[PDB]
Amino acid sequence: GHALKATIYKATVNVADLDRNQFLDASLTLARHPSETQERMMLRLLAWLKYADERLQFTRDDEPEAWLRNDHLGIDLWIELGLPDERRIKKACTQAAEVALFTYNSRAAQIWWQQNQSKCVQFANLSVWYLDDEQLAKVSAFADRTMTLQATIQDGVIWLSDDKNNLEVNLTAWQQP
Template sequence: MAIGAMIHTFTVQLADVDRGVYDELALRAARHPSETDAYMVTRVLAYCLEYEEGIRFGEGISSTDEPAVVVRDLTGAVAAWIEVGAPDAERLHYASKLGGRTRVYTHRDPVKLLASWEGKTIHRSDAIVLRSFDAGFVDAAAALIERRNALTVSVTEGHLYLELNGASLSTAVHEHALP
């Protein structure tokens, strides 16, 4: 019998000063058995940092038709395709053709990820943004994850301040241009 996804809940206080977004969120993130805690933390952070009307988690790693996080407008069209981890160039090429904005949030080494895309055809690569965090930040946050989580996310001047289950962490949010 296959093991099912584990549901993690997050009560989030979001204060993104850089974008003028302030809200309280109740998130349920299903973590597939093959998904690491670091990936799930990055997915939740991507959701918070891209939060706007129409945002939701994608269908999961088993779905090739959706990203980890997606924003749809009122007509159902994709307004933002938000990947997590290390998507291949072909997937970014497809995402960028859908319209809207394309973002990638990674918990991996961004230099290696950018190198993997070098020389590949990616539609509107100059408009795609890769975001990463300081080394060790995501792993430290992943170590604090429980089934039920209290999360405070504050962003100001490109710096992320995170309080997760009573522990405080911070990181710069790095933006990288695609090759």
């Protein structure tokens, strides 16, 4: 049947979330379409690491970047990227117990946040994280066709590591429930 034209990336990841006491090994598969920049892909991956779960899956139209479904087939977590509009955010928030949004394009995001902050506050179950240009570029450097990563999370800070390098990642919390 149908298939996506895309580049396949594999990541063996170890996550130690010391805030949550969440310890997990997973092997992730990311499909990157020519329309997706390296950064946005790595932001996806970062997103996954922050909400690491055995059940948390990527997916692709109008679906989230990733979702975690429960035993009754409903959406526990909806992960979204970019700078969505009123109708898009409403779609996610009313369809999912929790929504986590990752905003990223500095110039674009500030204008979007100035024009939306007051409207996003309307959704009781919405989290908004921002990651600035520099950090996004640094996260993106970790990109490899085959990746082996370990992520330690403590006090909101994400310590991201491979064989060669070590990076402190600090997501900014624009909104929290």
